Structures are given as structure tokens and as C-alpha cells.
Amino acid sequence: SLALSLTADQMVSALLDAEPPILYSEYASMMGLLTNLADRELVHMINWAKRVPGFVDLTSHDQVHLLECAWLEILMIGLVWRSMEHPGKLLFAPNLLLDRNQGKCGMVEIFDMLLATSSRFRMMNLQGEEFVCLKSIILLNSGVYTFLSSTLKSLEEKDHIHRVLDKITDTLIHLMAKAGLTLQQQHQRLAQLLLILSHIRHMSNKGMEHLYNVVPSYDLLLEMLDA
């Protein structure tokens, strides 16, 4: 796979080039606007995912499983990235900057978790090159432990995913070493960034929990991938 031959800078360059644009809110019903926004973001997310090195080496069934498990975490981590420069606020779009008081509409509990994630990123001085690495880890990791098959192909697919995840780890480390971090600082920061992904999983599970609907089904994702 081409992905496994990439250097750290080529991997970063590929991911930076795949970044979807920042969409605007069309306009009210909170769910209304957020739903309209997320629906337009998902279309760009499928095209982004097709451009993550290694992803299209997988079967369509496995690409859908990964997206089904990761899509809300991917939307949330984009939101948190957008919001770093707005302490106390969530920048859903450039024309939809919501503060905490506008979550009281069980939405506040998740707003708070999202704000805490944005704060953490700010604290850490999270860089854009690191963000795109983290977003692609979410895509490949979130669903990998729940492939439901035991065929040779499934084993080969999971093994490919883990080698791409290793490549992204190497990339994260190279970015930090090139920024001047000591060997120990490199390990510590890699771990800090990966541990935040556990909180993003938690937030996504909450959001799903309170929802239960408007979730993209397996069949919906398969068709968007086929097009």
C-alpha cells in the first residue's frame, strides 16, 4: 500500500490537502440548524475519508463500518478544533458561535465536555498538523475492534489498519521531534493526545445516548461511499 511507504511530511501533506472546508449554518430550532449543518459536513467527510492514506485499500464494507463508528467523533473533534480560539464558546460554524447558556435547550452536559476538550487542546498548543493526524486516528481506530468477521480478509484488513496507525504514530513523533521536543517530551505528548481520544469516544457515546434516528445507517454510508 502506498500509505505505508509515505514519509512523515508526505503523510501530513496528504492529510492537510484532504481537509474539508469549514461550512456555514444556513440560518430557530437548534436541532434544525445543527442537523442541516452536520448533514452537509458528512458529505465532505466521506470525501475526506477516501483521501486518508490507507483507507481506500480497505473493502467498502470495512470503510462503512469505520465511518459508522467514527462519524460523530469526527464531527466533534472538528468542532473542538474550530473552537480553540473562542474560550467558553463552541464555533459550530463561523455564523453559529454558541456559548454555554444556549445549550440549555440535556445538551449542556455535552457542551461542557466539548468546551473542556477545547480547553485541553488550547493548553497543549495543539497544532494543525497534529489535529489532522488525530482525526485520521479516530477514523481508523474507532471501529477496528468491532469488525464482525473471522475470514482471512478480515484479518488482513485489521492488520492493514494497525500498520497505518503505526505510520500515523511515527508521523506524530516526527512532527514533535522536528518542533524541538526531547525524546521524553515526544512520548509524553503522544500519550496526552491519544488519551484525549478516549474522552472524545465518551462524548460521542453520550451524544448518541441522549439522541435515542438521524444517525447515518450502514446502508446510507455504503451508498455515499459508492458515489
Q: Is 117 in the site for a copy of itself (CB under 8 A)?
A: yes
Among 9, 99, 156, 209, binds a copy of itself (CB under 8 A): 209
Give the nearer residue to ligand A1AHW in terms of CB position, either 122 or 174.
122
120 labeled binding residue: no
Interactions with a copy of itself, residue window 42-101 (CB under 8 A): none
Q: In sequence order, what DSSP letters do the residues of 20-73 get, joined into one string?
A: PP--------HHHHHHHHHHHHHHHHHHHHHTSTTGGGS-HHHHHHHHHHHHHH
Shortest distance in whole angstroms from residue 24 CB to a copy of itself: 29
Distance CA 153, CA 151 (A): 5
Residue 125's region, left for phi above 0, alpha for psi from -120 to 50, else beta, is left
174 known ligand binder: no
Q: Choose from a copy of itself, ligand A1AHW, none: what does 41 bind? Cβ within 5-8 Å by kind.
A: ligand A1AHW
Residues 100-138 as b/e (b if ≥16 CB within 10 A, e otherwise) read eeebeeebeebbebbbebbebbeeeebeebbbbbbbbbb
Q: Tell me the per-residue interface mask from 182 to 201 with a copy of itself, x by CB under 8 A, - otherwise.
A: -xx-xxx-xxx-xxxxxxxx
Asked whether 64 and 221 are in contact (CB, 8 A), the reply is: yes
- Cβ of residue 168: shortest distance to a copy of itself, in angstroms? 8
Q: Which does 214 bind (CB under 5 to 8 A by kind): ligand A1AHW, a copy of itself, none?
A: ligand A1AHW
Q: What is the Cα–Cα distance from 90 to 41, expressed in whole angstroms? A: 16
List of residues contacting a copy of itself (CB under 8 A)? 112-113, 116-117, 120, 137, 141-142, 145-147, 162, 165-166, 169-170, 173, 183-184, 186-188, 190-192, 194-202, 205-206, 209
